[PDB]
């Protein structure tokens, strides 16, 4: 094309950036896992949380029990009960970017295969000092940042779940909120006409007596 | 079974070989200074075939789907295994007497 | 279905994401190798995407309603990050081969 | 500028030249890769003589 490049720069400046950023991300993930947190909770907190979860589950699924039991539980919960670390996550990114800019900047790295406008030029050519060069040619720092940004999906794929990248309050308040939310719920039984639904068609006794009765293990 | 791993490996190797061939051809062509832009057809066919084979092989190893119906895996569950509570096990029965009293 | 299990849908989503990411990366690599450039190459990407969806059908087969509510997530699921990975690998391999 | 290197100026004729159908260019390319591998092995042989 326009410029003639030395193959040595391709062999010795392109790959190391990718290797360094990949392994830096992996190390960041493993270190973040290593010292994630250590939290302890007292008995009252977990007991109250379980009570709140039970009340929420009652409110959500009271439509599968007889109405008398639902209202018996609703008489309860109303009178007696409800009423009685990062520095290593972000700073190493900037530090490594600065170190790479220090020890690698000063030459053309590669070129994107699609045309761009002059708006792209100030971002992709931090190190070079030319004036009329096209915006497709990129510097080393821009390539490093592009490589950093374009690895979230790869990290999510090759590594478990998603990591290695950047992006109750008051018991009485919760008790009052749940008391107010539960007061407007009414029982709606879901078994009123189950028999008629069952009687519509014959039972599905197909594909049940295939194979053979198991004899022993394996 | 395990043949899909071999298939995807062969596809990746073929793609890498095609990449090396294309790079070598470009490096040779830039020496002679010919502006004809001659891309051999066999390389294109090889890389397209390798890409298709690799994608087909890799689509078969991502896993298997599972039914979203919550009452699908309980059709074979029985009450024999539902009444066993590991936290409340007691070893005071006739099993000890029968085997080496 | 009256009752839905979150584990199955999350597993299906994980499988779809795995397939999408891998196929996008591979398509970007092969587009870079072919030496295509400009919006022309973009067309190839779309073509590749279609191919992926087709294979997913053969993976789903019939009775697909058990696994998914509709085919819309199966067709237009994850066309944002895949494009970024595609363009990244495209630039990387095009610089590695046709340049120098 | 000096004349183009003979080992490549004459190589232009024998390299990157259409010979036969689809079964020929890839065979000659792989033979060229084999001889390039042989040259690489020969070059590293004289590292310690």
UniProtKB/Swiss-Prot annotation, chain A:
Effect of residue 28 to K: No effect on EMC assembly and no effect on membrane insertion of hydrophobic transmembrane helices-containing proteins by the EMC
GO BP terms: protein insertion into ER membrane by stop-transfer membrane-anchor sequence; tail-anchored membrane protein insertion into ER membrane
Cell compartment(s), UniProt: Endoplasmic reticulum membrane
SMART domains: DUF106
Phenotypic consequence of residue 28 to A/E: No effect on EMC assembly but decreased membrane insertion of hydrophobic transmembrane helices-containing proteins by the EMC
Keywords, sorted A to Z: Endoplasmic reticulum, Membrane, Transmembrane, Transmembrane helix
Effect of residue 145 to A: No effect on EMC assembly and no effect on membrane insertion of hydrophobic transmembrane helices-containing proteins by the EMC
Lumenal topology ranges: 1-11, 103-140
Annotated membrane topology: Multi-pass membrane protein
The keyword DNA-binding belongs to this UniProt entry's keyword annotation: no
Task performed by this protein: Part of the endoplasmic reticulum membrane protein complex (EMC) that enables the energy-independent insertion into endoplasmic reticulum membranes of newly synthesized membrane proteins. Preferentially accommodates proteins with transmembrane domains that are weakly hydrophobic or contain destabilizing features such as charged and aromatic residues. Involved in the cotranslational insertion of multi-pass membrane proteins in which stop-transfer membrane-anchor sequences become ER membrane spanning helices.
PANTHER family: ER MEMBRANE PROTEIN COMPLEX SUBUNIT 3
Transmembrane intervals: 12-35, 87-102, 141-159
The UniProt record lists the keyword Iron: no
Pfam family, one: EMC3_TMCO1
Curated annotation (Swiss-Prot), chain B:
Membrane side Lumenal: residue ranges: 21-41
GO molecular function per UniProt: cobalt ion transmembrane transporter activity; ferrous iron transmembrane transporter activity; inorganic cation transmembrane transporter activity; magnesium ion transmembrane transporter activity
Ranges that cross the membrane: 2-20, 42-61
Superkingdom classification of source: Eukaryota
Major subcellular site: endoplasmic reticulum
Membrane topology listed for this record: Multi-pass membrane protein
Gene Ontology annotations of biological process type: copper ion transport; magnesium ion transport; protein insertion into ER membrane by stop-transfer membrane-anchor sequence; tail-anchored membrane protein insertion into ER membrane
GO cellular component: early endosome; early endosome membrane; EMC complex; endoplasmic reticulum membrane; Golgi apparatus; Golgi membrane; membrane; plasma membrane
Keyword Magnesium found: yes
Key words of the record: Endoplasmic reticulum, Endosome, Golgi apparatus, Magnesium, Membrane, Phosphoprotein, Transmembrane, Transmembrane helix, Transport
Compartments in which it is found: Endoplasmic reticulum membrane; Golgi apparatus membrane; Early endosome membrane
Binding partners and assembly: Component of the ER membrane protein complex (EMC).
Family: Belongs to the membrane magnesium transporter (TC 1.A.67) family.
The protein's name: ER membrane protein complex subunit 5
Species lineage: Eukaryota, Metazoa, Chordata, Craniata, Vertebrata
Shown residues in whole-protein numbering: 3 to 103 of 131
Swiss-Prot record, chain C:
Signal sequence, renumbered to the chain: none
Domain of life, per lineage: Eukaryota
Pfam family, one: EMC6
Keywords on record: Acetylation, Endoplasmic reticulum, Membrane, Transmembrane, Transmembrane helix
Topology in the lipid bilayer: Multi-pass membrane protein
Entry GO CC: EMC complex; endoplasmic reticulum membrane; membrane; omegasome membrane
Protein name: ER membrane protein complex subunit 6
Gene that this polypeptide is encoded by: EMC6
Swiss-Prot record, chain D:
Subcellular location: Endoplasmic reticulum membrane
Subunit text: Component of the ER membrane protein complex (EMC).
Disease per record: Cerebellar atrophy, visual impairment, and psychomotor retardation: An autosomal recessive, neurodegenerative disorder characterized by developmental delay, intellectual disability, hypotonia, scoliosis, cerebellar atrophy, and variable dysmorphic features.
Function in brief: Part of the endoplasmic reticulum membrane protein complex (EMC) that enables the energy-independent insertion into endoplasmic reticulum membranes of newly synthesized membrane proteins. Preferentially accommodates proteins with transmembrane domains that are weakly hydrophobic or contain destabilizing features such as charged and aromatic residues. Involved in the cotranslational insertion of multi-pass membrane proteins in which stop-transfer membrane-anchor sequences become ER membrane spanning helices.
UniProt record similarity statement: Belongs to the EMC1 family.
Protein name per the record: ER membrane protein complex subunit 1
Gene: EMC1
Section of the entire sequence shown: 459 to 507 of 993
């Amino acid at each position: 094309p326009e410029l003639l490049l030395d193959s040595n720069i391709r062999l010795w400046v392109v790959l190391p950036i990718v290797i360094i950023t990949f392994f830096v991300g992996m190390i960041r993930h493993y270190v973040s896992i290593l010292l994630q947190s250590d939290k302890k909770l007292t008995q009252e907190q977990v007991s109250d949380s379980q009570v709140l979860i039970r009340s929420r589950v009652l409110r959500e699924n009271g439509k599968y029990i007889p109405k008398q039991s639902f209202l018996t539980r609703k008489y309860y919960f109303n009178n007696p009960e409800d009423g009685f670390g990062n520095v290593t996550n972000v700073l190493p990114m900037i530090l490594i970017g600065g170190w790479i800019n220090m020890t690698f900047s000063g030459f053309v790295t590669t070129k994107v295969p699609f045309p761009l406008t002059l708006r792209f030029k100030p971002m992709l050519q931090q190190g070079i000092e030319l004036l009329t060069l096209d915006a497709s040619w990129v510097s080393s720092a821009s390539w490093y940042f592009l490589n950093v940004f374009g690895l979230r999906s790869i990290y999510s794929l090759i590594l478990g779940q998603d990591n290695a990248a950047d992006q109750p309050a008051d018991t009485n308040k919760a008790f009052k909120t749940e008391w107010e939310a539960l007061e407007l719920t009414d029982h709606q039984w879901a078994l009123d006409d189950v028999e008629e639904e069952l009687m519509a068609k014959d039972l599905h006794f197909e594909g049940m007596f295939k194979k053979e009765l198991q004899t022993s293990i394996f | 079974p395990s043949l899909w791993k071999g298939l995807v490996g062969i596809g990746l190797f073929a793609l890498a070989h095609a990449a090396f061939s294309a790079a070598q051809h470009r490096s040779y062509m830039r020496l002679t200074e010919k502006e004809d832009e001659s891309l051999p057809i066999d390389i294109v066919l090889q890389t397209l075939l390798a890409f298709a084979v690799t994608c087909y092989g890799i689509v078969h190893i991502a896993g298997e789907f599972k039914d979203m119906d919550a009452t699908s895996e309980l059709k074979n569950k029985t009450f024999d295994t539902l009444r066993n509570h590991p936290s409340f096990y007691v070893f005071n029965h006739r099993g000890r007497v029968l085997f080496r009293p | 279905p009256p009752f839905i299990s979150e584990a199955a849908v999350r597993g299906n989503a994980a499988v779809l994401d795995y397939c999408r990411t891998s196929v996008s990366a591979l398509s970007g690599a092969t587009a870079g190798i072919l030496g295509l450039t400009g919006l022309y190459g973009f067309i190839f990407y779309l073509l590749a995407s279609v191919l992926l969806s087709l294979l997913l059908i053969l993976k789903a087969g019939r009775r697909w309603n058990k696994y998914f509510k509709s085919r819309r997530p199966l067709f237009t699921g994850g066309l944002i990050g895949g494009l970024f990975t595609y363009v990244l690998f495209w630039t990387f391999l095009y610089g590695m081969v046709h340049v120098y | 500028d000096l004349p183009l290197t003979g080992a490549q100026a004459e190589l232009e004729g024998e390299f990157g030249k259409k010979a036969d159908g689809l079964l020929g260019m890839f065979l000659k390319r792989l033979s060229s890769q084999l001889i390039l591998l042989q040259a690489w092995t020969s070059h590293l042989w004289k590292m310690f003589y």
